[PDB]
Write an enzyme that holds these catalytic residues in place. Structure first.
Site, short mmCIF file in Angstrom:
data_model
loop_
_atom_site.label_atom_id
_atom_site.label_comp_id
_atom_site.label_asym_id
_atom_site.label_seq_id
_atom_site.Cartn_x
_atom_site.Cartn_y
_atom_site.Cartn_z
N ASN A 77 8.65 -3.75 -40.61
CA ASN A 77 9.58 -4.71 -40.42
C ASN A 77 8.91 -5.72 -38.75
OD1 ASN A 77 12.02 -3.03 -40.41
ND2 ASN A 77 12.29 -4.11 -42.23
N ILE A 84 9.39 -10.68 -36.88
CA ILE A 84 10.37 -9.62 -37.05
C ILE A 84 10.65 -10.20 -38.29
CG2 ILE A 84 11.65 -8.59 -35.80
CD1 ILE A 84 10.39 -9.67 -33.42
N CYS A 85 11.77 -9.51 -39.30
CA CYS A 85 12.27 -9.27 -40.57
C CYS A 85 13.97 -8.88 -39.83
CB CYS A 85 11.96 -9.23 -41.53
SG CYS A 85 10.39 -9.57 -42.70
N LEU A 86 14.63 -10.00 -39.03
CA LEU A 86 15.82 -9.70 -38.58
C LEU A 86 16.57 -10.66 -38.98
CD1 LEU A 86 17.14 -6.86 -36.52
CD2 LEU A 86 16.28 -8.48 -35.14
N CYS B 581 9.78 -12.36 -44.27
CA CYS B 581 9.85 -11.39 -45.99
C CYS B 581 9.87 -12.14 -46.91
CB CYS B 581 11.17 -10.44 -45.22
SG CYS B 581 10.74 -9.43 -44.06
#
Ligand code: ATP
Ligand code: MG
Ligand code: MG
Lengths: 149, 977, 80
Positions: A77, A84-86, B581
């Site tokens: 991630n 960052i994918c959070l 994403c």
């Protein structure tokens, strides 16, 4: 206030029990912080020290802060850009949360990557099909970039 | 036919091509050429209808100049329509304008819409009787002091194909019970309303819904809603997608005659629900009064006329059976202000009426149905004498405004010193309003307008002070010149600047500049500048008039020192953004591929280039970048690839390069992704990976016969060529010949120091530089939008997303803001209706008004500003926003002592800008070298920068603790250097 | 005293949100519900009723909000 809120969080960081990670202003700029997250002992990141850049928006805490990794890390991630994918950093953010909460979230993501929400499909693929190969690469990457010179 | 996108761009994003085509085939007639009529004509001319015909044989009178900005004192005595025609003709070369000296009923058939102002009720009835039965749209409006009315009748069978301009609602489905209970995906709102129609697609369980037949929606929850029992076909569906269908709507309008007894009202203010009925009577009484006085209206503040006027109101009220009491004080104001002619009211009604004209000629947006009665009565001055004597005419161009505000107030307006930030759309309308009002025409008066921008073609559509010949010139300068012509008294009373308001211009717009200002007016297109101006107004304690537009929408805000909160006191939604994403590997909307494409454009024709020019610019770019970039390899490979590995020698090599990119971003990467996550992939939960937002992609096989593939090669090849100064070509033959001989390098889903030293020394290429592509959305020949559209649509094909054309991609990628003259005019009027409240020095917060509106749906709403927050510091009541400490340039230590000694507080935090100067938690050693330092010195050191010689003050923010360790809010500090 | 009533919140886009409330409800509560229905953060909600912007710490009754009352949810624009 926006700047006063960032300050309240700063002052409260020194009033908290000795934690693993660290964070604070860069050159006395309350809107540009530098943070460090210790690679978790229970992970292939153990031993590494990971630096992050933190930029607070003029309308903080109503809007989330921009957190980026400046230390390279082999993770599903997090990409070569530090992105960052959070959840907590975007749609799960509320004025109630803080940097401490974020750092803890990032630290938890390190010990428990999220392969279902991949930012780097290649790494997530290895995490899913060959965990030991991923841990080797994660440990090696930690050794090559997260030990500091 | 073919619309001029170069001129209509921003407006096209509001109305659409189809609406503008119908507009171009529609003639419009406008009766009345006073302030109101000219404003309507102006907006209609800019919008682009077929032609405008004017009718107004009445001679120009001096009072008409209070709002008719195209008339001059030399035109006095000359029929208004004749004087005005040539001025309107100059606005849009695509819209002929003419005058008719006489009208007949049969002549009205030449128009799609008839607009009527300054006309008696009896004449209106006669005109409307005919138009109503002859399928001719009818609009009537009048400006009477601080009161206004608009009436629309578009016939009994008007069809509206779009009632709000909102994009159709869409969303992802999770499951659809046989009972019709549809459920969105986890935490997904459908946003639908009862009555809406929606069709489906990708529904798995009942291929019948994918038909295309829209059904009626029955909302049950923000995440669920019913469509009806779908038991007939399928027992349960899932993984589908609904899309709302906007079905045409018939709107039946009653004639003027048949609706006078029972009018349908549109309320501009729900806080004045009782006024429209009162105004309906009053405006009819004005016409009945005029009929008994050879067309003359009641005189300014004249009691005799008002009493006679009130008698008409009673009779009229009785005749239409009005079971509600007449508000005598309210009604008589309409008589007292009957001759009032305010430019702010013409801007407000004129812009709104013009939008209605466009609704009649396009069938787009919901029309006013049917009577709109408005007032801005709170704008009436109270700090001066308003009487028959002070409001009487003086044979002056401002007689129209004096009739309402008086001569005394006329001087306060003339003596104003203003600062206008921005000379764009809102800027031009504002400058015109100020000119008609006589703002700054007095001895102590003045106007300062600044803008760093230059006039562009698409600006002309809604910045009416500029002309095609002015393109390329500075906005501020041209606007200043334009208004000096509208009102000669402004000659030498206006200073234009070409400065971008902000930190870098505080040298020009400093303390001296501000101190003399009466007020600041914003006309900006970004929140950053708005916040900056707001901060400065708070510091200098100057009033701020703020406004904004977006398509047919708009708003106004007034900031009053020591009374209201400021602009920055409240929150607005964040700019549009997307999950990183989602953009990288899981797009599902066209916006996702357009953003990806923009980034691709940067990563191929810009970022790499700057790296190559930096390697040939700085002495140690490699040294620095080795520890200054987040990815040294990328910077290295960029230099290598762009200097040798991939450097083109001919355009054909550019085409070859473009062909390679196609496989890199629309084929190989997709295969690798499918390899990493096979279509049969599953989550750690067990559910299928590729579901909902994640759409299993498909690699693309290049084919020159596919138009998008071809557009990409042409755009990418031409952009690459631009990077190396190589001449590009468009002859399809050349591409075919080159592509034909391409040998697709073998690819298979895979399961640094040398790169540097192998680079030619910078000194071996001095004088050679690459030209980086700088994103420019408005130049249709630079291949920018062509590239992003193609790149985006190909990725759209990869993920099976509906592609967007260049027109739409230009809007999304270019972040173009929808805009038109109508809403621009409306906000300017509302802002100037607030400006007069400031000049009257109103102290009551409820007298002020923040406005919001959406002309597309006839919605206007107003609210009193929010009072600034108060607080107590040692008993004293302090204004959290406007109050401040005025201390000298003492040292840190001294300042800390001042608060402990005086306010009896402990300074815990001190900051200057974003820099923390002091904190009660810093280490003693640190504080040791700072405490003895004076604030000024402390700032210069911490910020690592020296103050400017013009700097006269320093603003600091401070935090203090109550003697009981608790915290106590405290105002900011002003350090006088 | 207080009682139940149905109110409407119309946005600048024309959308209409229907709400069932008690005149005793605080403006803070209403904002909470709007956030659930539309996902809009309270800090961004500009509600207006009869010419007044509703502030936290008050009740619908404080603004004399009746049954079938219509409120507006607006926004500030940045172009122009
Ligand atoms: N900081 C600033 N100081 C002074 N003027 C500014 C500042 N920021 C923006 N402006 C000006 O405000 C105006 C905004 O008006 P508007 O959006 O109608 O014009 P535009 O930007 O030329 O049009 P478009 O967005 O269609 O290209 C512009 O003329 C712009 O240059
Ligand atoms: Mg511009
Ligand atoms: Mg702009």
């Amino acid at each position: 206030m926006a700047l006063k809120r960032i300050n309240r969080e700063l002052a409260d960081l020194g009033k908290d029990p000795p934690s693993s990670s660290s964070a604070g202003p860069v050159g006395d700029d309350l809107f540009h912080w530098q943070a460090t997250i210790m690679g978790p002992a229970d992970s292939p990141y153990a031993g590494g020290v990971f630096f992050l850049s933190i930029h607070f928006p003029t309308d903080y805490p109503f809007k989330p802060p921009k957190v980026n990794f400046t230390t390279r890390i082999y993770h599903p991630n997090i990409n070569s850009n530090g992105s960052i994918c959070l959840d907590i950093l975007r749609d799960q953010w509320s004025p109630a949360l803080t940097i401490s909460k974020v750092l803890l979230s990032i630290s938890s993501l390190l010990t428990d990557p999220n392969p279902d929400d991949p930012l780097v499909p290649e790494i997530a693929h290895v995490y899913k099909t060959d965990r030991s190969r991923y841990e080797l690469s994660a440990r090696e990457w930690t050794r090559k970039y997260a030990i500091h010179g | 036919n073919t619309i001029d996108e170069g001129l209509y761009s921003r407006q096209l994003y509001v109305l659409g091509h189809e609406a503008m085509k119908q507009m171009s085939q529609s003639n419009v007639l406008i009766i009345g050429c006073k302030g109101l009529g000219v404003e309507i004509a102006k907006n209609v001319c800019l919008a682009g209808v077929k032609s405008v015909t004017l009718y107004d044989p009445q001679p120009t009178r001096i009072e008409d100049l209070s709002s008719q900005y195209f008339l001059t004192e030399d035109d006095i005595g000359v029929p208004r329509a004749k004087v005005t025609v040539s001025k309107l003709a100059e606005l849009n070369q695509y819209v002929p304008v003419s005058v008719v000296d006489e009208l007949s009923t049969e002549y009205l058939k030449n128009f799609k819409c008839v607009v009527v102002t300054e006309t008696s009720l009896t004449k209106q009835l006669e005109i409307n009787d005919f138009t109503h039965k002859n399928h001719i749209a009818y609009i009537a409006a009048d400006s009477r002091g601080l009161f206004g009315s608009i009436f629309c009748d578009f016939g009994e069978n008007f069809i509206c194909t779009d009632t709000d301009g909102n994009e159709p609602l869409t969303g992802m489905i999770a499951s659809i019970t046989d009972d019709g209970v549809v459920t969105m995906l986890e935490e997904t709102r459908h946003g639908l309303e009862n009555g809406d129609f929606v069709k489906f697609t990708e529904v798995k369980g009942m291929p019948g819904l994918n038909d295309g037949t829209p059904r009626k929606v029955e909302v049950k929850g923000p995440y669920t809603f019913s469509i009806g029992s779908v038991k007939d076909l399928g027992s349960a569906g899932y993984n589908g997608v609904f899309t709302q269908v906007k079905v045409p709507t018939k709107i039946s309008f009653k004639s003027l005659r048949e609706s006078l007894k029972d009018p349908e009202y549109v309320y501009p203010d729900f806080g004045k629900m009782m006024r429209p009925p009162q105004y309906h009577i009053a405006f009819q009484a004005l016409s009945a009064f005029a009929d008994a006085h050879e067309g003359s209206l009641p005189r300014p503040r004249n009691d005799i006329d008002a009493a006679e006027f009130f008698e008409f109101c009673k009779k009229i009220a009785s005749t239409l059976q009005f079971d509600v009491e007449l508000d005598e004080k309210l009604i008589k104001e309409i008589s007292y202000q009957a001759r009032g002619d305010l430019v702010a009211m013409s801007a407000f009604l004129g812009g709104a009426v013009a939008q209605e004209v466009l609704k009649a000629t396009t069938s787009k947006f919901y029309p006013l149905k049917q009577y709109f009665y408005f007032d801005s009565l709170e704008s009436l001055p109270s700090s001066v004498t308003i009487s028959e004597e002070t409001c009487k005419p003086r044979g002056c161009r401002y007689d129209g405004q004096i009739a309402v505000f008086g001569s005394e107030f006329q001087e306060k307006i003339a003596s104003l010193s203003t600062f206008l930030v921005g000379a764009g759309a809102i800027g031009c309308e504002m400058l015109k309003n100020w000119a008609m009002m006589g703002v700054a025409t007095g001895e102590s008066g003045h106007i300062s307008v600044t803008d760093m921008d230059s006039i562009e073609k698409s600006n002309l559509n809604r910045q009416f002070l500029f002309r095609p010949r002015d393109v390329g010139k500075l906005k501020s300068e041209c606007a200043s010149t334009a208004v000096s012509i509208m009102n000669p008294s402004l000659t030498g009373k206006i200073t234009s600047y070409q400065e971008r308001v902000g930190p870098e211009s505080e040298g020009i717009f400093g303390d001296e500049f501000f101190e003399k200002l009466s007020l600041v007016t914003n006309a900006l297109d970004n929140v950053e500048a708005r916040m900056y101006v707001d901060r400065r107004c708070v510091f200098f304690e100057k009033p701020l008039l703020e406004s904004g537009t977006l398509g047919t929408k708009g708003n106004t805000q007034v900031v009053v020192p020591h009374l209201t909160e400021s602009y920055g006191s409240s929150q607005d939604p964040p700019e549009k953004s997307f999950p990183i994403c989602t953009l990288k590997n899981f797009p599902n909307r066209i916006e996702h591929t357009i953003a990806w494409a923009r980034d691709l454009f940067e990563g191929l024709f810009k970022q790499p280039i700057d790296n190559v020019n930096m390697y040939l610019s700085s002495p140690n770019f490699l040294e620095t970048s080795l520890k200054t970039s987040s990815n040294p390899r990328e910077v290295l490979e960029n230099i290598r690839d762009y200097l040798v590995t991939e450097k083109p020698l001919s355009f054909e090599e550019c085409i070859m390069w473009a062909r390679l990119q196609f496989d890199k971003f629309f084929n190989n990467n997709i295969q690798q992704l499918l390899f990493n996550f096979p279509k049969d992939s599953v989550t750690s939960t067990g559910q299928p990976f590729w579901s909902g937002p994640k759409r299993a992609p498909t690699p693309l096989s290049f084919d020159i016969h596919n138009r998008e593939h071809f557009d990409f090669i042409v755009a990418a090849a031409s952009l690459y060529a631009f990077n190396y100064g190589l001449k590009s070509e468009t002859d399809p033959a050349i591409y075919e010949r080159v592509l034909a001989g391409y040998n697709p390098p073998p690819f298979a889903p895979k399961s640094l120091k040398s790169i540097a030293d192998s680079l030619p020394p910078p000194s071996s290429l001095v004088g050679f530089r690459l030209t980086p592509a700088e994103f420019e959305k408005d130049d249709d020949s630079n291949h920018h939008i062509d590239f992003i559209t193609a790149a985006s649509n190909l990725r759209a094909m990869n993920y099976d997303i509906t592609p967007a054309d260049r027109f739409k991609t230009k809007f999304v990628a270019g972040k173009i803001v929808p805009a038109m003259c109508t809403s621009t005019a409306v906000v300017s009027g509302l802002v100037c209706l607030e400006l007069v409240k400031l000049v009257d020095g109103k102290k009551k917060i409820e007298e002020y008004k923040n406005g919001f509106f959406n002309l597309a749906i006839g919605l206007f709403t107003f609210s009193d500003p929010i009072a600034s927050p108060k607080m107590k510091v040692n008993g004293k009541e302090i204004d959290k926003i406007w109050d401040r400490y005025n201390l000298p340039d003492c040292t840190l230590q001294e300042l800390i002592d001042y608060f402990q000694k005086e306010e009896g507080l402990e300074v815990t935090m001190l900051s200057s800008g974003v820099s923390l100067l002091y904190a009660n938690f810093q280490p003693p050693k640190k504080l040791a070298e700072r405490l003895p330092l004076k604030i000024s010195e402390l700032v210069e050191q911490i910020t690592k920068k020296k103050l400017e010689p013009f700097r006269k003050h320093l603003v600091l923010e401070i935090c203090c603790d109550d003697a009981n360790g608790e915290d106590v809010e405290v105002p900011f500090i002003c350090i006088k250097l | 005293h207080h009682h139940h009533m149905q109110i409407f919140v119309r946005t600048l886009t024309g959308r209409t949100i229907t709400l069932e409330v008690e005149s005793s409800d605080t403006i803070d509560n209403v904002r909470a519900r709007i956030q659930d229905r539309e996902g809009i953060p309270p800090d961004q909600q500009r509600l207006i009723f009869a010419g007044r912007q509703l502030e936290d710490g008050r009740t619908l009754a404080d603004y004399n909000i009746q049954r079938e009352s219509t409120l507006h949810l607006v926004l500030r624009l940045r172009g122009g």
